[PDB]
Amino acid sequence: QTNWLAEIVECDRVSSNVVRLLLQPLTADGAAPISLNFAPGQFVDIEIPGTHTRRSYSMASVAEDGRLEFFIRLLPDGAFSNYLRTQASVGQRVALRGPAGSF
Amino acid sequence: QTNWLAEIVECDRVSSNVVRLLLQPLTADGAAPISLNFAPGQFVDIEIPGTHTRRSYSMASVAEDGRLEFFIRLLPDGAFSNYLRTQASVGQRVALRGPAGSF
Numbered sequence: 096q097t098n099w100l101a102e103i104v105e106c107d108r109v110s111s112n113v114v115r116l117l118l119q120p121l122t123a124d125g126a127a128p129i130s131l132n133f134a135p136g137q138f139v140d141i142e143i144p145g146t147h148t149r150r151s152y153s154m155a156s157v158a159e160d161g162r163l164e165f166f167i168r169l170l171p172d173g174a175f176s177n178y179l180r181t182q183a184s185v186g187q188r189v190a191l192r193g194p195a196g197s198f
Numbered sequence: 199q200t201n202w203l204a205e206i207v208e209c210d211r212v213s214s215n216v217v218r219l220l221l222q223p224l225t226a227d228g229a230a231p232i233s234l235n236f237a238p239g240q241f242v243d244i245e246i247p248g249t250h251t252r253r254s255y256s257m258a259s260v261a262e263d264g265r266l267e268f269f270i271r272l273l274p275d276g277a278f279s280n281y282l283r284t285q286a287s288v289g290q291r292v293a294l295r296g297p298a299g300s301f
């Protein structure tokens with residue numbers, strides 16, 4: 096509903112300091128289409144594994160199969176930025192809260 | 199085309215050190231609809247007034263008349279953050295480039 100699990104499908108550089116993060120939300124077999132729950136421009140709050148630290152990211156696109164695309168600028172000494180540089184890997188499961196369209 | 203002039207129509211401090219920024223891209227009276235050119239989830243590069251400093255921001259939602267909404271986290275001592283925190287005001291006109299959906 097507002098708490099989701101998602102699996103990292105891609106975590107790649109697309110410039111010197113931007114990463115494309117692709118996540119696949121996980122749902123029960125036979126559930127409603129994932130694309131019904133998420134729209135481009137809405138954001139989710141992603142928790143860094145092993146922490147209670149969350150950051151908001153905008154969904155650049157939502158694929159037919161529900162895959163969520165993010166473009167994330169890496170900052171020096173940033174919590175989520177460090178996670179993407181040192182820990183994030185394809186197959187890792189992360190907790191997402193949302194989606195939301197306002198703060 | 200790809201360079202736009204936009205008026206700040208809202209610049210509000212909302213929850214969690216986030217600013218809700220609403221921009222109106224400026225066009226001639228009677229022009230092609232802005233909202234066909236800008237889509238949620240795409241991003242634009244906004245320049246800080248009086249500088250050559252630009253940052254990318256994701257469009258959360260787009261009005262039929264082309265008003266663009268962004269939710270921007272204020273970082274301690276960031277360039278655009280510092281601008282939003284203390285300098286930005288309703289009625290200012292800013293340069294933005296885009297939209298884009300890829301790197």
Ligand SMILES: Cc1cc2nc3c(=O)[nH]c(=O)nc-3n(C[C@H](O)[C@H](O)[C@H](O)COP(=O)(O)OP(=O)(O)OC[C@H]3O[C@@H](n4cnc5c(N)ncnc54)[C@H](O)[C@@H]3O)c2cc1C
Pocket residue numbers: 138150151152153154165166167168169170171172173174175176177216256269270271273274275
């Ligand atoms: C609705 C929404 C959507 C967003 N969408 C996107 C998106 O699509 N893409 C994207 O890249 N970002 C997006 N953001 C921004 C994002 O949430 C994070 O702010 C960004 O990724 C940085 O997080 P971080 O954990 O890497 O860095 P943080 O841990 O927050 O650190 C940020 C910087 O602060 C510095 N810092 C820490 N403490 C101090 C201090 N006391 N003084 C000075 N500097 C300090 C750190 O060294 C670091 O450089 C969005 C934000 C919101 C609110």
Ligand SMILES: Cc1cc2nc3c(=O)[nH]c(=O)nc-3n(C[C@H](O)[C@H](O)[C@H](O)COP(=O)(O)OP(=O)(O)OC[C@H]3O[C@@H](n4cnc5c(N)ncnc54)[C@H](O)[C@@H]3O)c2cc1C
Pocket residue numbers: 113153166167168170171172241253254255256257268269270271272273274275276277278279280
């Ligand atoms: C495609 C895309 C979409 C995005 N969408 C959003 C969005 O919707 N909302 C959003 O909030 N952000 C978004 N971002 C992130 C945004 O572009 C900016 O990165 C963010 O707003 C910070 O910019 P700034 O000018 O405030 O800070 P900057 O001037 O870039 O500085 C950031 C931080 O770096 C720290 N710093 C500088 N040098 C050092 C050092 N040597 N060591 C440690 N720390 C240091 C500063 O203290 C500061 O905290 C997006 C990024 C991309 C690429």
